[PDB]
Design a protein around this nucleic acid. Structure first.
Lengths: 114, 115
DNA sequence: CTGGGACCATGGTCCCAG
DNA sequence: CTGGGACCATGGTCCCAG
């Protein structure tokens, strides 16, 4: 298939041009729940580097991207920085995968694992 | 004695104006190794949010402050985050001393979180 | 000039063993 | 109780290589 990120970028544009920022419209157009369009679009709002943490962009779920996007709203810098962190780690041969990535990214905001 | 952090702010200024940014010049002036000036100054670069995690700024060594600074270079936000996270642990009465603080702060950069 | 690596003695702390 | 050995991070200093 095509990753959420991809789907997201596409939706986002049709949203902006073809439908003047009206979700419902785009949703009807694509014939799919509004939520989906939301999840994908928010996923595409994620910094390139974060997507880069995954072997294939398709490994970032519409659902996790969305969750991620929201969790880091007004914290893009933080996200970016913590991302390069994880990049440097796998640059050092460390190997995490999908589910582990999104969890690592998030740990930062949590007093818990932090 | 005065804290590395403090010393750092002093060295820092003297550097910018009084010596056109020549560590060597400053060093000779203060009659001390260059490295010391370096270390303290980098310590002073740390977010006041971090110095706060310590009972007294003197608890933060020139040495560790320096290491901390180099470690979080280009990652000041991340640092600040971890800082606040820690601020809460103690907000909740939790307590750790000097050494632990620096380890916890730095921990975010290591993989031991799961390995 | 500058940062980094190698070193150094110190204050200080643990803990083992008489 | 007491001394001593094993450690420790620190402030510092040298000196090499960009």
């Amino acid at each position: 298939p095509t990753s959420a990120y991809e789907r997201g970028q596409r939706y986002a544009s049709r949203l902006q041009n073809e439908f003047a920022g009206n979700i419902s419209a785009l949703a009807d157009a694509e014939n799919i729940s509004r939520k989906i369009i939301t999840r994908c679009i928010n996923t595409a709002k994620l910094p390139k580097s974060v997507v880069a943490l995954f072997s294939h962009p398709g490994e970032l779920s519409a659902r996790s991207g969305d969750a991620l996007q929201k969790a880091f709203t007004d914290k893009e810098e933080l996200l970016k920085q913590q991302a390069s962190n994880l990049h440097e780690q796998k640059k050092a041969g460390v190997i995490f995968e999908a589910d582990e990535v999104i969890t690592l990214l998030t740990s930062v905001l949590k007093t818990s694992s932090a």
